[PDB]
Paper text:
Three salutaridine/menthone reductase like subfamilies of short‐chain dehydrogenases/reductases (SDRs)2 from Mentha piperita were identified, namely (−)‐menthone:(−)‐menthol reductase (MMR), (−)‐menthone:(+)‐neomenthol reductase (MNMR), and isopiperitenone reductase (IPR).1a,1b MMR and MNMR catalyze the ketoreduction of (−)‐menthone 1 a to (1R,2S,5R)‐menthol 2 a and (1S,2S,5R)‐neomenthol 2 b, respectively.1a Additionally, they act on isomenthone 1 b to produce (1R,2R,5R)‐neoisomenthol 2 c and (1R,2S,5S)‐isomenthol 2 d, respectively. Interestingly, the three Mentha SDRs have high protein‐sequence identities (63–68 %), so we performed comparative studies of MMR, MNMR, and IPR, to pinpoint the determinants of ketoreductase vs. ene‐reductase activity within SDRs. A key difference in the sequences between the ketoreductases and IPR was a substitution of the highly conserved catalytic Tyr residue for Glu (238 in IPR). We determined crystal structures of both MNMR and IPR, the latter in combination with NADP+, alkene 3 a, and β‐cyclocitral (non‐substrate).
The MNMR structure was solved by molecular replacement using IPR as the search model (resolution 2.3–2.7 Å), and was found to be structurally similar (rmsd 0.97 Å). Major structural differences were not observed between apoprotein and NADP+‐bound forms. Therefore the bulkier MNMR Tyr 244 likely positions substrates in a different conformation compared to that observed for 3 a in IPR because of the larger side‐chain bulk of tyrosine. This is consistent with the helix of the flap domain (MNMR) being shifted compared to that in IPR, to accommodate binding of 1 a,b. KGaABiotransformations with MMR and MNMR showed only ketoreduction products, with no detectable double bond reduction.1a,1b Reactions with 1 a and 1 b generated the menthol isomers 2 a–d (entries 7, 8, 10, and 11).
Residue numbers in the entry: 11 to 272, 287 to 315
Amino acid sequence: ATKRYAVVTGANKGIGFEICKQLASKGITVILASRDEKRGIEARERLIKELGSEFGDYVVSQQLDVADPASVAALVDFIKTKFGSLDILVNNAGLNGTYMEGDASVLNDYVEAEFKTFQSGAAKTEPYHPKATGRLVETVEHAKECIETNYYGSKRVTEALIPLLQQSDSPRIVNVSSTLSSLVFQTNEWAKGVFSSEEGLTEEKLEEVLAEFLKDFIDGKQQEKQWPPHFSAYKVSKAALNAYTRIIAKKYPSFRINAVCPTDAEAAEAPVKLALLPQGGPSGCFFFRDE
């Protein structure tokens, strides 16, 4: 009933776009934030034409690069000067740390090998490239950008919007994570130890794991030190984001703050429900689709 305002980052396509669609249709006013201005503008255009001209006021595009303090800073001023309030933050902007060399479809063989780690719990530490048709590349620079967006970007956007969110009588923060965040994949036992702590976990300790991983990664010691052979930066940053979700969950008890692993409209249903979470929903939990 009460008019609400939401930001969804990385929302010009994919699941984010569907999150935006579903929030706007429930009467929420959505800020569609995207790394590129025109794609965000075009995404807004398609949503109102799909939803109806009566939603033109309920969807707004604003450019947002989460790795860029000035982009983040510009967005807070925009929400401040146009609306004055914020009730929902959905952190969906994210990077893989990976690309495919050669046949792009071999990626499904790499992803397949990872999900069989779920049904055996035996996390292999030696790299195994399923085909010579394609190769899953994980460069040093992509690992920095991946960590910088998935961890530091989300924290930067979250901390910048907390002051506005705290004037909500129901602030909701939703962090879009990934199944690869599961600790079954953390072959490095120290890092797994840090991430698993429920008491005495600090952001400084999280940042030490990220910095330590990036340094063994520079040094070419990914395998020496038992770091994941594939999706390595991706797994560590999204696992870090899960742990960070719990940290700020405990800091702000009046908020409901959660992470969720997510066609795209159905996968968007789980994060959208958490953005409209009743005041009694949990806080600090990792949901796979539906719990």
